[PDB]
Amino acid sequence: LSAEDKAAVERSKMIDRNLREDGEKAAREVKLLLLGAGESGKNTIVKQMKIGIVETHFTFKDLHFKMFDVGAQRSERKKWIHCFEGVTAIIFCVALSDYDLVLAEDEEMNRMHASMKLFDSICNNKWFTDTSIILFLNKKDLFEEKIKKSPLTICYPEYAGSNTYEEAAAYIQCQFEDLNKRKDTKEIYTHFTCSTDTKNVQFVFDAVTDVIIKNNLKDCGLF
Amino acid sequence: TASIAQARKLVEQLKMEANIDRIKVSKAAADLMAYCEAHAKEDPLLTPVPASENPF
Amino acid sequence: FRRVFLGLGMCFSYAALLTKTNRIHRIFEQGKKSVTAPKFISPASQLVITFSLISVQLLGVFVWF
Amino acid sequence: GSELDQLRQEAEQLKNQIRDARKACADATLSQITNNIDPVGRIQMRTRRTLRGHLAKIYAMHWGTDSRLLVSASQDGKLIIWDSYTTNKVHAIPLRSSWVMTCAYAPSGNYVACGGLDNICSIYNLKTREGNVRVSRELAGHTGYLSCCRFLDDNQIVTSSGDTTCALWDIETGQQTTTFTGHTGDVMSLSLAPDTRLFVSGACDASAKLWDVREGMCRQTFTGHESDINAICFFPNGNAFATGSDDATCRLFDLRADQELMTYSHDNIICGITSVSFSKSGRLLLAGYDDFNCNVWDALKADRAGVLAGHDNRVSCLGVTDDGMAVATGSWDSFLKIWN
Numbered sequence: 001l002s003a004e005d006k007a008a009v010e011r012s013k014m015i016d017r018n019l020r021e022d023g024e025k026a027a028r029e030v031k032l033l034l035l036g037a038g039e040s041g042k043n044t045i046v047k048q049m050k051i052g053i054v055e056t057h058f059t060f061k062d063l064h065f066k067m068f069d070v071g072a073q074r075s076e077r078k079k080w081i082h083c084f085e086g087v088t089a090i091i092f093c094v095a096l097s098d099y100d101l102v103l104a105e106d107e108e109m110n111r112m113h114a115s116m117k118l119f120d121s122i123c124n125n126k127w128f129t130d131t132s133i134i135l136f137l138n139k140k141d142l143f144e145e146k147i148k149k150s151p152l153t154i155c156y157p158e159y160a161g162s163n164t165y166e167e168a169a170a171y172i173q174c175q176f177e178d179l180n181k182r183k184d185t186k187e188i189y190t191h192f193t194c195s196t197d198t199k200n201v202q203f204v205f206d207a208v209t210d211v212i213i214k215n216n217l218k219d220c221g222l223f
Numbered sequence: 224t225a226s227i228a229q230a231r232k233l234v235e236q237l238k239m240e241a242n243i244d245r246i247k248v249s250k251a252a253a254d255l256m257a258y259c260e261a262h263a264k265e266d267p268l269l270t271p272v273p274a275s276e277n278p279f
Numbered sequence: 280f281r282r283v284f285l286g287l288g289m290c291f292s293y294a295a296l297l298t299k300t301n302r303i304h305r306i307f308e309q310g311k312k313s314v315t316a317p318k319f320i321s322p323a324s325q326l327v328i329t330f331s332l333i334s335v336q337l338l339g340v341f342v343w344f
Numbered sequence: 345g346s347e348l349d350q351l352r353q354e355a356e357q358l359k360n361q362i363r364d365a366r367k368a369c370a371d372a373t374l375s376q377i378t379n380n381i382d383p384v385g386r387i388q389m390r391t392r393r394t395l396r397g398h399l400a401k402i403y404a405m406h407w408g409t410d411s412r413l414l415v416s417a418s419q420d421g422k423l424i425i426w427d428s429y430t431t432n433k434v435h436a437i438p439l440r441s442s443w444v445m446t447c448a449y450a451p452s453g454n455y456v457a458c459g460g461l462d463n464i465c466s467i468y469n470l471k472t473r474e475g476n477v478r479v480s481r482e483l484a485g486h487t488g489y490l491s492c493c494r495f496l497d498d499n500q501i502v503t504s505s506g507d508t509t510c511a512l513w514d515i516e517t518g519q520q521t522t523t524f525t526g527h528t529g530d531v532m533s534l535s536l537a538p539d540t541r542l543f544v545s546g547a548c549d550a551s552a553k554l555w556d557v558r559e560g561m562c563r564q565t566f567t568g569h570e571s572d573i574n575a576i577c578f579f580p581n582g583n584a585f586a587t588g589s590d591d592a593t594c595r596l597f598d599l600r601a602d603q604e605l606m607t608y609s610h611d612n613i614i615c616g617i618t619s620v621s622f623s624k625s626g627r628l629l630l631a632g633y634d635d636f637n638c639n640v641w642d643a644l645k646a647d648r649a650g651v652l653a654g655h656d657n658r659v660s661c662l663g664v665t666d667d668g669m670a671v672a673t674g675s676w677d678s679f680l681k682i683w684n
Binding site: 226227230231233234236237238239240241243245246247248249250251252253254255256258259262263265266267268269272277278279 | 347348351352354355358359361362365366369370371372373374377378381384385387389392393428429561562563564565579580581583584598600601602603605623624625626627628643644664668669670671682684
């Protein structure tokens, strides 16, 4: 082996060392996929987490998150959805103050029905069979102020319940957690977000920590 | 307005497509069935190469 | 047989207990700090650790003999 | 209203003229002419090199002109240049996006391009006086994810996007000289002609199109599939190309008789095709599938000629090299394998 070849092997070993260090660094970060409707309050939640694709790094209690967002990607989701098979969790927003509205100029489509359809598609996808979901049900104050004048019968014909923030919110929540047909592999963490909530980072921290511990226990065959 | 413009654009595109000089399929098949015979001996994926050259 | 087997059962039981409790502690402690699973949490590695701790007593008994 | 119907009716009339003119050209089938041809023997290739170092899914690769140097793009945020002869690593380039889908190696060898899920095609300079690989230009203008890019020269590039359009760029000024429109569905791949005069593209509308590099016009459109087209490549002559789809089939199209010639299919495969490349003679057609395998077909007879099985996940990219020696596969299992 010539001296030049020895120099080449030296350089290759340096490159391998650098790549190993970078991979070990990248393996310890939480990767989140932020999904939701355009007007579902994604921007406010993004703002209160951090104190084509848009990336937002943020740290909480000595742990790191990257939090990818794909809202501005108007194309077929089946083509690029498999790029997110190995993410830690999926965050999904609903915007409860949408049960008496219409979208996409269809003029016969409840916004919340479209949200349920999207949730059903994402939850029962082939690439996401063991990925937990954090469901934020936000704009609850508008729901509280609105529920008096308009009942839930516009969005749900069968309600058999009272018009109060105590029972309608729970009714909407039990609708979304009943579309999950994989109850023995994943779970849904539901939280009610609002303006100046300031307590959503900790909820995400708790959910992701539980997810990590459960994954590690399942790998050991200990769960 | 946009729909009629799209329709006219498709009409022009189809009329440009439908005026090609198309040869019959036997000629194309013979033309491509003869390329391999001309370049068979220089392709080592189907004919193995002796271990002398074999960069790998 | 008396010399070898007198303290072997207690060693077995308590080495196994120590290894399993350590596994649970490490999992639930590093679960709050990194995504990556802690190293050596698997039946093979745990058995290796347990039988190394037993091998200590076995070698001591050998020196005694 | 009425003239909308008139335009539609003219459209079906033009389609009918196209189809019966096509049927007036089919003397026989490729199987009829190639009925009596010396069968290709069984190909038994074995892996010779194994390139390790990537830590995530690999999404694209491209061979160099010299047939030694290689480029690989992974979702780990890395673009790696390999010396295949010695397995050595020549350059490691960090990526700003890490959501790459495509990469390319320039004919001159001084430039490398990459792109994906950022609507930007990035160009890197390999030969610099400072001794490091730097960004030369960031091409922007697409409104959808990049799917494939190819170099024409040092100063000309072509890109395809998920916004259903293609583009030609001059790199000194970084502007779109020509835009190619059509393809009502998402574009997935493109292939350049050997004379760099035309190029073909495949889309999610289950159709392919042939474009002229100058004049920005579409000349021929080809149909025949039941689902999305994922890969495309030219036959070495330059008078035909091949496409692979999600309907678990491959097909071959000629240009002078603008219709389908042959379809490669079986009953044991139900998964789609991710990549397609030709050999130097054109007698062999290589295709990577979703069942972790690579299948080698005989183009003139359409029979299974070989299977390559050494991968633990989906095979995503192929390359055949300019002098015909080695084939390279890149897969989701983070490894590149070279076969001969």
